Symmetry: C3
Subunit: 143 residues, 3 copies
């Protein structure tokens, strides 16, 4: 049990449990509800954050972990699939204790407070295809 939720039409209001890794939980939620595609938005507070910064020129990537209290001012992302497997693409903006903002591609975050997310289910297959030139999985609406 990583969350509780309420279904309202095509949306789920998801309350993630405290001290839970949010990305793991959102993936679990989408797998347990069989969500094909959709959006994820929300807010909350965290005690750990890992962001990834990808360099398209060299293909190097940097994963930075912050270990401090932060407020999620916005988590924005989408749901799709690859080979029928849930694929989340989530970005995030957070505020530190001095109100300065950090932002980027979200890999993980550990809740420390509330975690209030809206998951909209589009009920529609949306797939991605790996682009070997970019090293990225890009939307592919015709597959």
């Amino acid at each position: 049990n990583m969350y509780s939720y309420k279904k309202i039409g095509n949306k789920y209001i998801v309350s993630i449990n405290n001290h839970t890794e949010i990305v793991k939980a959102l993936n679990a939620f989408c797998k347990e509800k069989g969500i094909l595609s959709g959006s994820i938005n929300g807010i909350g507070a965290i005690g750990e954050l890992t962001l990834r910064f990808f360099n398209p020129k060299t293909k190097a990537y940097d994963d930075k972990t912050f270990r401090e209290q932060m407020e999620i001012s916005n988590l924005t992302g989408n749901i799709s699939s690859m080979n029928e497997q849930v694929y989340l693409h989530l970005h995030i903006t957070v505020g530190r204790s001095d109100y300065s903002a950090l932002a980027g591609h979200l890999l993980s975050a550990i809740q420390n407070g509330a975690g209030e997310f809206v998951v909209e289910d589009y009920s529609e297959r949306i797939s991605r295809t790996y682009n070997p030139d970019l090293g990225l999985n890009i939307y592919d609406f015709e597959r």
Copy 2:
């Protein structure tokens, strides 16, 4: 008078009056329209901002007020009810004149320019319960 609006299906486009405190206005809007739960998202510009940072370890909190021109790059939040009243939980990301970003839990903001918000009405009850161990008002899908 604090705002003008347009109803479009399950949403309202809300244009807050200039020089008006946005949180007060959004509360008043939701109250006027009897919105039990929903979401709020938008953008605009402000001349004053108050954010709160809560320390879960000591239960200290601080409220910081900025008195300068800022752009709201994103205001994100949700609507629910608590103690017979509208309950708004809003976070925000703002840009300063040097384009640096601040982020956090929004208490108030005074518009100075435009204020353009989308309010979705879920037409369903979502309440909250204060968790005395955390010191936070947490979604309660049962009450």
Copy 3:
């Protein structure tokens, strides 16, 4: 060609082509689809960003790799012409965030946006006291 898309009910999932200017692409999408009003939200990666800061009483271009943590905006019209009001928050290679009014941005990676079509005319009126185009729901 600046994008590909998928229509899902009242929404469009828009994938902007790499190396494209996103504001121009989004404007082009809204004109092609005849969108009267709506919302735009999404994420992606960019190599150039121009932000504007309006003094009610300045533009700056950043030339570096950035992640768009959020792009938030709306669609309306003035004199039947598509009007996009877009703000943005980005992360730099040191993870610090920049935020503001979006003039333009060049994609360098993915560009994944959800465009909701409201199917309703929403206009604006120039307010000369402010120097801004403000929503006018009665016109």
